[PDB]
Design an enzyme around this catalytic site. Structure first.
Site, PDB file in Angstrom:
ATOM      1  N   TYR A 188       0.818  -1.219   0.000  1.00 43.79           N
ATOM      2  CA  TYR A 188       0.000   0.000   0.000  1.00 43.79           C
ATOM      3  C   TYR A 188       0.849   1.266   0.000  1.00 43.79           C
ATOM      4  O   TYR A 188       2.013   1.263   0.383  1.00 43.79           O
ATOM      5  CB  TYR A 188      -0.921   0.000   1.223  1.00 43.79           C
ATOM      6  CG  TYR A 188      -0.173   0.177   2.529  1.00 43.79           C
ATOM      7  CD1 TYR A 188       0.475  -0.887   3.131  1.00 43.79           C
ATOM      8  CD2 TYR A 188      -0.117   1.426   3.147  1.00 43.79           C
ATOM      9  CE1 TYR A 188       1.164  -0.716   4.325  1.00 43.79           C
ATOM     10  CE2 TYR A 188       0.569   1.602   4.337  1.00 43.79           C
ATOM     11  CZ  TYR A 188       1.205   0.529   4.918  1.00 43.79           C
ATOM     12  OH  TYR A 188       1.878   0.704   6.108  1.00 43.79           O
TER      13      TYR A 188
ATOM     14  N   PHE B 134       2.298   9.663   3.531  1.00 42.61           N
ATOM     15  CA  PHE B 134       2.558   9.510   4.959  1.00 42.61           C
ATOM     16  C   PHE B 134       2.940   8.092   5.357  1.00 42.61           C
ATOM     17  O   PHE B 134       3.393   7.862   6.487  1.00 42.61           O
ATOM     18  CB  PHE B 134       1.346   9.946   5.795  1.00 42.61           C
ATOM     19  CG  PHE B 134       0.040   9.244   5.490  1.00 42.61           C
ATOM     20  CD1 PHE B 134      -0.278   8.034   6.079  1.00 42.61           C
ATOM     21  CD2 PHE B 134      -0.856   9.824   4.595  1.00 42.61           C
ATOM     22  CE1 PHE B 134      -1.473   7.400   5.774  1.00 42.61           C
ATOM     23  CE2 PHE B 134      -2.050   9.193   4.283  1.00 42.61           C
ATOM     24  CZ  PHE B 134      -2.336   7.971   4.860  1.00 42.61           C
ATOM     25  N   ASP B 135       2.771   7.104   4.480  1.00 38.05           N
ATOM     26  CA  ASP B 135       3.136   5.728   4.835  1.00 38.05           C
ATOM     27  C   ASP B 135       3.169   4.897   3.558  1.00 38.05           C
ATOM     28  O   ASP B 135       2.328   5.134   2.684  1.00 38.05           O
ATOM     29  CB  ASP B 135       2.145   5.137   5.826  1.00 38.05           C
ATOM     30  CG  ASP B 135       2.520   3.819   6.463  1.00 38.05           C
ATOM     31  OD1 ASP B 135       3.697   3.398   6.405  1.00 38.05           O
ATOM     32  OD2 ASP B 135       1.619   3.148   7.033  1.00 38.05           O
TER      33      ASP B 135
ATOM     34  N   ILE C 142      -7.315   1.302  10.660  1.00 38.12           N
ATOM     35  CA  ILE C 142      -8.424   2.267  10.696  1.00 38.12           C
ATOM     36  C   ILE C 142      -9.687   1.730  10.039  1.00 38.12           C
ATOM     37  O   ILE C 142      -9.677   0.840   9.186  1.00 38.12           O
ATOM     38  CB  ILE C 142      -8.012   3.596  10.019  1.00 38.12           C
ATOM     39  CG1 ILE C 142      -7.576   3.456   8.557  1.00 38.12           C
ATOM     40  CG2 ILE C 142      -6.918   4.290  10.809  1.00 38.12           C
ATOM     41  CD1 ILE C 142      -7.318   4.768   7.850  1.00 38.12           C
TER      42      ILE C 142
ATOM     43  N   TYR D 230      -8.449   9.066  10.958  1.00 31.67           N
ATOM     44  CA  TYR D 230      -7.909   9.440  12.268  1.00 31.67           C
ATOM     45  C   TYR D 230      -8.705  10.551  12.944  1.00 31.67           C
ATOM     46  O   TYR D 230      -8.283  11.051  13.992  1.00 31.67           O
ATOM     47  CB  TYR D 230      -6.431   9.816  12.141  1.00 31.67           C
ATOM     48  CG  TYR D 230      -5.551   8.622  11.800  1.00 31.67           C
ATOM     49  CD1 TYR D 230      -5.191   7.692  12.759  1.00 31.67           C
ATOM     50  CD2 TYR D 230      -5.106   8.437  10.493  1.00 31.67           C
ATOM     51  CE1 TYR D 230      -4.389   6.603  12.443  1.00 31.67           C
ATOM     52  CE2 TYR D 230      -4.311   7.354  10.157  1.00 31.67           C
ATOM     53  CZ  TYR D 230      -3.954   6.450  11.140  1.00 31.67           C
ATOM     54  OH  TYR D 230      -3.164   5.374  10.814  1.00 31.67           O
TER      55      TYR D 230
ATOM     56  N   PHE E  40      -5.638   5.920  -0.184  1.00 31.03           N
ATOM     57  CA  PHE E  40      -4.738   4.769  -0.180  1.00 31.03           C
ATOM     58  C   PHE E  40      -4.848   4.018  -1.511  1.00 31.03           C
ATOM     59  O   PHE E  40      -5.934   3.920  -2.072  1.00 31.03           O
ATOM     60  CB  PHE E  40      -5.044   3.802   0.946  1.00 31.03           C
ATOM     61  CG  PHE E  40      -4.706   4.238   2.359  1.00 31.03           C
ATOM     62  CD1 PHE E  40      -5.614   4.982   3.098  1.00 31.03           C
ATOM     63  CD2 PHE E  40      -3.512   3.876   2.953  1.00 31.03           C
ATOM     64  CE1 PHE E  40      -5.323   5.322   4.404  1.00 31.03           C
ATOM     65  CE2 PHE E  40      -3.204   4.244   4.247  1.00 31.03           C
ATOM     66  CZ  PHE E  40      -4.122   4.970   4.987  1.00 31.03           C
TER      67      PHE E  40
END
Length: 160
Positions: A60, A70-71, A88, A114, A131
Protein backbone atom coordinates in the site's frame (compact mmCIF):
# COMPACT_ATOMS: atom_id res chain seq x y z
CA UNK A 1 -6.65 34.28 18.38
CA UNK A 2 -9.59 32.81 20.30
CA UNK A 3 -11.47 31.49 17.29
CA UNK A 4 -8.35 30.41 15.39
CA UNK A 5 -8.65 26.66 16.05
CA UNK A 6 -12.29 26.65 14.97
CA UNK A 7 -11.58 28.58 11.78
CA UNK A 8 -8.61 26.42 10.83
CA UNK A 9 -10.63 23.25 11.31
CA UNK A 10 -13.47 24.80 9.30
CA UNK A 11 -10.94 25.28 6.46
CA UNK A 12 -9.73 21.71 6.89
CA UNK A 13 -13.25 20.31 6.76
CA UNK A 14 -14.08 22.32 3.62
CA UNK A 15 -11.11 21.37 1.44
CA UNK A 16 -11.27 17.83 2.83
CA UNK A 17 -14.93 17.64 1.81
CA UNK A 18 -14.02 19.02 -1.62
CA UNK A 19 -11.49 16.21 -2.05
CA UNK A 20 -13.97 13.49 -1.08
CA UNK A 21 -16.75 14.85 -3.24
CA UNK A 22 -14.59 15.14 -6.35
CA UNK A 23 -13.28 11.60 -5.85
CA UNK A 24 -16.80 10.22 -5.34
CA UNK A 25 -17.90 11.99 -8.53
CA UNK A 26 -15.61 9.76 -10.61
CA UNK A 27 -17.94 7.53 -12.62
CA UNK A 28 -16.23 4.30 -11.58
CA UNK A 29 -15.88 5.29 -7.93
CA UNK A 30 -18.28 3.53 -5.56
CA UNK A 31 -19.55 5.20 -2.38
CA UNK A 32 -20.63 2.95 0.49
CA UNK A 33 -23.21 3.97 3.11
CA UNK A 34 -20.41 4.44 5.66
CA UNK A 35 -18.84 7.18 3.55
CA UNK A 36 -16.01 4.97 2.27
CA UNK A 37 -15.32 5.51 -1.45
CA UNK A 38 -13.33 3.11 -3.61
CA UNK A 39 -12.06 2.73 -7.17
CA UNK A 40 -10.95 -0.61 -8.54
CA UNK A 41 -7.46 -0.65 -10.00
CA UNK A 42 -7.31 -4.40 -10.61
CA UNK A 43 -9.66 -7.34 -10.21
CA UNK A 44 -8.12 -10.36 -8.43
CA UNK A 45 -8.92 -14.05 -8.92
CA UNK A 46 -9.18 -14.97 -5.23
CA UNK A 47 -12.18 -16.91 -4.00
CA UNK A 48 -12.49 -15.43 -0.52
CA UNK A 49 -12.26 -12.12 1.32
CA UNK A 50 -10.50 -12.04 4.70
CA UNK A 51 -12.48 -12.38 7.90
CA UNK A 52 -12.08 -9.55 10.40
CA UNK A 53 -9.21 -11.40 12.09
CA UNK A 54 -7.39 -12.87 9.08
CA UNK A 55 -3.75 -11.91 8.55
CA UNK A 56 -3.38 -10.23 5.12
CA UNK A 57 -0.27 -9.42 3.07
CA UNK A 58 -0.82 -5.92 1.70
CA UNK A 59 1.17 -3.57 -0.49
CA UNK A 60 0.00 0.00 0.00
CA UNK A 61 0.67 3.72 -0.24
CA UNK A 62 -1.13 6.29 1.91
CA UNK A 63 -1.37 9.91 0.74
CA UNK A 64 -2.97 13.13 1.98
CA UNK A 65 -5.36 15.12 -0.18
CA UNK A 66 -2.39 17.07 -1.60
CA UNK A 67 -0.49 13.93 -2.56
CA UNK A 68 1.93 13.89 0.39
CA UNK A 69 2.83 10.26 1.23
CA UNK A 70 2.56 9.51 4.96
CA UNK A 71 3.14 5.73 4.83
CA UNK A 72 4.13 3.15 2.23
CA UNK A 73 5.09 -0.54 2.20
CA UNK A 74 6.50 -0.07 -1.27
CA UNK A 75 9.17 2.35 0.06
CA UNK A 76 10.10 -0.42 2.48
CA UNK A 77 10.43 -2.88 -0.41
CA UNK A 78 8.12 -5.56 1.00
CA UNK A 79 4.46 -6.00 1.91
CA UNK A 80 3.13 -5.46 5.44
CA UNK A 81 0.96 -7.90 7.38
CA UNK A 82 -2.39 -6.57 8.63
CA UNK A 83 -5.56 -7.94 10.20
CA UNK A 84 -8.69 -5.93 9.27
CA UNK A 85 -9.37 -5.37 12.99
CA UNK A 86 -5.92 -3.78 13.55
CA UNK A 87 -6.26 -0.85 11.15
CA UNK A 88 -8.42 2.27 10.70
CA UNK A 89 -12.15 1.81 10.05
CA UNK A 90 -12.01 2.57 6.33
CA UNK A 91 -9.44 -0.16 5.89
CA UNK A 92 -11.40 -2.58 8.05
CA UNK A 93 -14.42 -2.22 5.82
CA UNK A 94 -12.53 -2.31 2.52
CA UNK A 95 -10.34 -5.32 3.27
CA UNK A 96 -13.42 -7.45 4.05
CA UNK A 97 -14.66 -6.66 0.52
CA UNK A 98 -11.38 -7.54 -1.20
CA UNK A 99 -10.04 -10.84 -2.51
CA UNK A 100 -6.52 -12.02 -3.32
CA UNK A 101 -5.26 -9.98 -6.27
CA UNK A 102 -7.71 -7.09 -5.83
CA UNK A 103 -6.15 -3.62 -5.97
CA UNK A 104 -8.28 -0.66 -4.94
CA UNK A 105 -7.91 3.06 -4.45
CA UNK A 106 -9.65 4.04 -1.21
CA UNK A 107 -10.84 7.55 -0.37
CA UNK A 108 -11.44 7.59 3.39
CA UNK A 109 -13.30 10.46 5.06
CA UNK A 110 -11.80 11.67 8.33
CA UNK A 111 -14.41 9.96 10.51
CA UNK A 112 -13.30 6.55 9.19
CA UNK A 113 -9.62 7.52 9.46
CA UNK A 114 -7.91 9.44 12.27
CA UNK A 115 -10.86 11.74 13.00
CA UNK A 116 -10.94 14.99 14.95
CA UNK A 117 -7.57 14.63 16.66
CA UNK A 118 -5.70 13.35 13.64
CA UNK A 119 -2.81 10.88 13.71
CA UNK A 120 -0.88 13.15 16.06
CA UNK A 121 1.93 13.69 13.56
CA UNK A 122 1.70 14.39 9.85
CA UNK A 123 -2.05 13.73 9.61
CA UNK A 124 -3.92 16.75 10.94
CA UNK A 125 -7.48 16.90 12.29
CA UNK A 126 -10.32 16.28 9.80
CA UNK A 127 -8.09 14.74 7.11
CA UNK A 128 -9.49 12.46 4.41
CA UNK A 129 -6.95 9.84 3.31
CA UNK A 130 -6.16 8.31 -0.06
CA UNK A 131 -4.74 4.77 -0.18
CA UNK A 132 -3.64 2.50 -3.03
CA UNK A 133 -4.23 -0.95 -1.45
CA UNK A 134 -3.19 -4.24 -3.07
CA UNK A 135 -4.37 -7.44 -1.32
CA UNK A 136 -1.58 -9.84 -2.14
CA UNK A 137 -2.56 -12.91 -0.12
CA UNK A 138 -4.37 -14.10 2.97
CA UNK A 139 -3.26 -16.58 5.59
CA UNK A 140 -4.89 -19.92 4.86
CA UNK A 141 -6.49 -18.38 1.76
CA UNK A 142 -9.10 -16.33 3.62
CA UNK A 143 -12.05 -17.22 5.87
CA UNK A 144 -14.39 -14.27 5.24
CA UNK A 145 -17.05 -13.56 2.59
CA UNK A 146 -17.15 -15.44 -0.70
CA UNK A 147 -16.38 -13.62 -3.96
CA UNK A 148 -20.03 -14.07 -4.90
CA UNK A 149 -21.15 -12.50 -1.61
CA UNK A 150 -18.73 -9.61 -2.08
CA UNK A 151 -19.85 -8.97 -5.65
CA UNK A 152 -23.49 -8.89 -4.66
CA UNK A 153 -22.80 -6.36 -1.92
CA UNK A 154 -20.87 -4.20 -4.38
CA UNK A 155 -23.50 -4.53 -7.11
CA UNK A 156 -26.22 -3.27 -4.75
CA UNK A 157 -24.04 -0.43 -3.50
CA UNK A 158 -23.39 0.69 -7.07
CA UNK A 159 -27.13 0.65 -7.78
CA UNK A 160 -28.05 2.60 -4.64
Amino acid sequence: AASHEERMNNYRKRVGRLFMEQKAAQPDAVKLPSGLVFQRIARGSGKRAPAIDDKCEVHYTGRLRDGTVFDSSRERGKPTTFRPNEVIKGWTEALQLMREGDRWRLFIPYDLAYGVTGGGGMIPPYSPLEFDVELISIKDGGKGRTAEEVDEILRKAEED
